[PDB]
């Protein structure tokens, strides 16, 4: 029983053409829409090999024994295997070890070792890396020592004579157990963030797919908003719910924030989506901050005017100003440009917008928001991000246009790829023609 | 402009009756359904005071200076303030300090100090507790020292002469900075898990509300499944999407797992919801694992038979066996019973079910899955959970009924409150009458 009977043993992305397979991934709906958009599918095996080769190279360039990962998103990067991802972000039951020779082990939940079997780069599946109070009570230490010894033995074999173990984040008991085995603990996030920083050819294809799925879901949310707002019952949550459903229907995973806000609730920014019944002749501003198809994040922001009357002239000005902000900064994007050059040379927002502008003008994106962060010059920390842009980096370009004490904020954001010769904006979503004038 | 014009300055839960308020919470839809079910609303101010008094008492009983929390769910428990919760679970930008005298400080995202203002128990709002590589690059240490000094100064004033600082989870750089200020770092999760372990009168009311909202959302998912399955397009994700939407429409927050599985994909258990097109005459088994209204978790599980033909006799047997398992174990619930007594005296699953049974027979629940864990005797760790049940504890009672190499699994789960005299099952959701026979 096939997911695509109109194909052989595999899907166009190399995954098993079997409706009864363990693996999840995009839905028929999403595949259909991408075929129509004529988007090349990612070869998942190749994508996974690329990530593992790159991550392994990073461990070796640093002279480390290995990299031990407890962050679910780092685990995803290294193995592409999901397991109760959201539960995992705050209950650290999983671990992945990447040894300097490329050898990779997964400690998974005790009763689900099969979840990472589809990726033969994961050489072993074990249990017992769960070193928190909920899972072990007053008996975490015994287990911490068992686990740490396992790590020691693995790296004696796969990284003989190396003492430095990068760890992304670990529970205190785990840290001390690892130290008691003789490991010098290094910052794992500097390793993973820099590895994640450059996408390979299949990661690009994947992001193209995810981005499209996200945009279709956003359009569905817009359709619903423009059709319901004014009925005196449809709230911010009702609208936002369309983005949740339509992301899931395309094989998406979750939404990182609650950044949808209507009317006066959009200034100051960062107020959360909730029960406010929306109204005609108001701006709705939102940011997708979305983990979608193939586990790829689409992080884009738009502001919408729903109403028959024209918007106030300051709304139109703010909108056009955000668009100019994004498009100007985007033009700076080229390989070899340093991050702080981007900080220095940012397009300058008007005075009434400086105080409440966004925490950065750009940031990385992959499986979620990622390194680097490109802060505005008045916040840039010297020596913090002294690195060049490289081809394959994918960044979100931001604009928050928010008057101090103001009535509304414009939030705009596009997702862009760095190429050999410059950049390529991956976002196709239109700007609201009424807010653009 | 009021959220409930049919009321004064406040909602029935004490929150501001203003559609333009910063605070989120349940929707008109959810409030309507709870009024009809005649459910008393939680007094939020009182709920928040109860949690703070209890958490503070725990810090003091231990002789600690304070408790520093970076886990978003612990922050929620202490302050009830949300901010990009899911982003926060894996990018630690927030911190809450609870001093031994009750004094409480929030370090929030640099541009959103207002988010915790609605809770005057949060005495200060600062920034700069964000000590990870994405937010700070190669300059985390400078900031780690600034933050750690702030903590030192606060506890000199609010906990003079005390050196022990419980921390739930912290980044390595933060840990060393705190140690360099002279703090003895203790396990924060033993503090928070034990505080969270007992709910007050308003937390109970809140959970009653959340549980109802979750059940209505599940019914909506059932309606949709029973009406669409067989159409040859409706997949696991399509069905699951109804739970996402309908939780959000009631002010819910997120779903911790992907535990919905159709047909043969339900054995082994822990396979994830995905693109498999569902079919008539198959079991769908699922677990809500849901963070709903008022931020309260409803964690329940059901199995459904959709089809005109009767289910196989082993499915009916498995179902009845799970129900017996849950109802028998539930009968053990009383204050003063020790956790390992529950382990020892569990109802015994049949032989064909022992190998693949669930990781526990019971666990705590509050803002998510919580301490304690009640493991089956063949996994129980002696001395790990030597504690009595107390009134106000709220536990989920589990049954996974899964034949080794089998065709399907039955997953059932109810959420229960411990009372003075025994227990009270809070779950009202029916069992599938076709699977019950
Ligand atoms: Fe964003
Ligand atoms: Fe962004
Ligand atoms: Fe559950
Ligand atoms: Fe459970």
Numbering used by the authors:
A (entry chain A), B (entry chain A): 9 to 445
Q: Can you quote the paper on this entry?
A:
Marine microbes are key in DMSP cycling by catalyzing its cleavage into acrylate and dimethyl sulfide (DMS), thereby releasing ∼300 million tonnes of DMS per year. The DddP family of DMSP lyases is distantly related to the M24 family of metalloproteinases. We were able to crystallize and solve the structure of a putative DMSP lyase from the DddP family, RdDddP from the marine bacterium R. denitrificans Och 114. Comparison with the amino acid sequences of the putative and the characterized DddP lyases showed these metal binding residues are invariant throughout the DddP family, and therefore likely critical for the biological function of these enzymes. Together, these results provide strong evidence that DddP lyases are metalloenzymes and that iron may be of relevance to the cycling of DMSP by marine microbes.
The preliminary structure determined by this approach served as a search model for molecular replacement using a higher resolution 2.15 Å native dataset. The crystal structure revealed a two-domain architecture for the 453 residues of RdDddP (molecular weight of 51 kDa) comprising an N-terminal domain of mixed α/β secondary structure and a C-terminal β-barrel domain. The crystal structure of RdDddP contained only one molecule per asymmetric unit; however, a tight interaction with a second peptide chain that was related by crystallographic symmetry in the P6322 space group was present, revealing the homodimeric organization of the enzyme. In RdDddP, this mode of interaction results in a large buried interface area of 3741 Å2 and creates a globular tertiary structure with a total surface area of 17701 Å2. We observed two substrate binding sites per homodimer, which were characterized as pronounced tunnels in the surface of the homodimer structure. The N-terminal domain of one chain snugs into the open pita bread fold of the other chain and thereby forms the walls of the tunnels, which end at the active sites located in the center of the pita bread domain. Hydrophobic residues predominantly line the tunnels and at the base of the tunnel, nested in the center of the pita bread fold, was electron density consistent with a pair of metal atoms, which presumably mark the active site of the enzyme. As iron was the most abundant ion that was identified in RdDddP by ICP-MS and TRXF these atoms were modelled as iron in the crystal structure. Six residues bind these two metal ions: the monodentate Asp297, Glu406, His371, Asp307 and the bidentate Asp295, Glu421 ligands. In conclusion, one monomer provides all the residues that coordinate the metal ions, and while the second dimer approaches the site it does not directly interact with the metal ions, which leaves an open space above them for substrate or water to bind and complete the coordination sphere.
